[model samples]
Target: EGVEITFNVNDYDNTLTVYTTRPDTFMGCTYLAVAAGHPLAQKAAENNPELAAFIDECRNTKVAEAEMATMEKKGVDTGFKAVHPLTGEEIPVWAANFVLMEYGTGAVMAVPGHDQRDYEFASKYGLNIKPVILAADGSEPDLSQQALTEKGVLFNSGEFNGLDHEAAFNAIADKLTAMGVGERKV
Candidate 1:
């Protein structure tokens, strides 16, 4: 069972490994999150003295863990935007501690209605929470307080709207291909 897996590591001097089981999920990654004490974060801190001071305060207060635990919600604007693979909308980027540098991908798709952390973060950040999936019974769940993780038909997703999750995945991937923005990595 010898299979080679190729990864496009970020351009950094340190060897920091990020885990992503779903390369397909890349299309949904709106931001990059790294630990405040990580090498890259340290570099950023060095260049921006103000950010460095903030990082110091954060470390001294040991608030990162508390924020990650109690908040279940957090975000900071990175002053960047990521284009939605399907809608081509420029989604804002945010860096949050809820995204562990040692965890899967070091970043995650902020699907508010599908992920609890994302739901809380989006709500706090005032980011639009669009629903991609809807109940098959056509009963919409209130997304203000909870995330809907169950499989259902796709809604609010242009072109791929109304299709089920699997269908939307295929169709969206195809659309991304035709636009030359993406090709099947698998």
Candidate 2:
């Protein structure tokens, strides 16, 4: 079971949601990744020539599903913003080359500190990479080098801080559901 992150689009009566198994890493999200073929991405490209061109370019580069994660990362700014459910922070939404439309929801909550693919994209685009998890032994991993995908204690996660992976999931799902913006999908 995992949680669906609902990112309310700023200035629009729209919401973009992404599913992820690692709800424990929610606090580490710095951006939202929308696939080239996603509806939000298409909407965002209407007035953004650069983004439109980027999407077209991505459409021409085909790769197998297995290589999607390891392929070079590329993205274009969609000039769209979303409100983070937990932090209330306005987050940038990008149309990304690596995000597949056929995948989970054609979008992803980019937790760079815990996901290698997101880490590479964030590093390439100079996006913020916040660490929210600590090693099981209470030690912090060198996120500057790579993502730490292990199940560990959470920090920098606001009220959910100090909770382990399993605990964070329940707590986060509760808050999100209460806010009417997210839900647990088993």
Candidate 3:
């Protein structure tokens, strides 16, 4: 099961629900990636020429499964922000080409330090990349070089610090559920 996080849009009375099995890394989320076909992207495009243009470009460019690994990752800011459920910080929302309409929720919470794709996107956009997951050997990964996707302990994750992946996942899911911004998906 996974957690469905409701990311409330800043300055707007709307929300974007994102699905993730890695809720333990929520504290490391640097930004939100919405598919070009997502409603929020379409809404933002209505008044944003740059985002509209980016959406059009994304529609024209298609990627096959074989080319997903090497596809040139690109995105344009929608000038929208999604509030983090736990930290209450505002995270930029981007109309990204990598997130597909057919994918889960058509949106993703990006944890740059633990996800390679997120790392590249954050590096390219100059977004914040916070390392939250510690290595099994109690060492920290050098996020400057690349992401660390290996399962490990959680630090820099308030309240969930020192907890392993499994524990943190359940804790985060339960906490978010109690906060009313999340729900466990079966």
In candidate 3, what are the lDDT values of residues 36-151, reduced to their tens digit? 98999988899999988888898998855468788998899989988898998898998888898875899999999999989999999999999999977899877768999898
Question: What are the per-residue Cα lDDT tens digits for candidate 1 across 84-130?
Answer: 54445565545555555443434444566665666677777777666
Please identify which of the two predictions, 1 or 2, would achieve the higher lDDT against the true structure: 2
- Candidate 3 positional error at 4, Å: 1.0
Q: How do the predictions measure up, each by TM-score?
A: 0.62, 0.94, 0.95
After superposition, which runs of candidate 3 have C-alpha atoms over 4 Å from their true positions?
Answer: none
Instruction: Tell me the number of clashing residue pairs for each predicted model.
Output: 1, 0, 0
Instruction: Report lDDT per candidate.
Output: 0.52, 0.86, 0.89
Query: Of the pair 1 and 2, which is ahead by TM-score?
Result: 2
Whole-model lDDT, model 1 = 0.52
When sorted by lDDT, best at the front, the candidate numbers are: 3, 2, 1
Q: Which digits, one per residue and each the tens of the lDDT, describe model 2 over residues 46-163? A: 8889888998998899856788767777898888888888898988999988888875888899899988888888899988899999977788778868888888889988898889
Better of 1 and 3 by lDDT: 3
In model 3, the worst 10-residue window by lDDT is 61-70
Model 2 RMSD in Å is 1.4
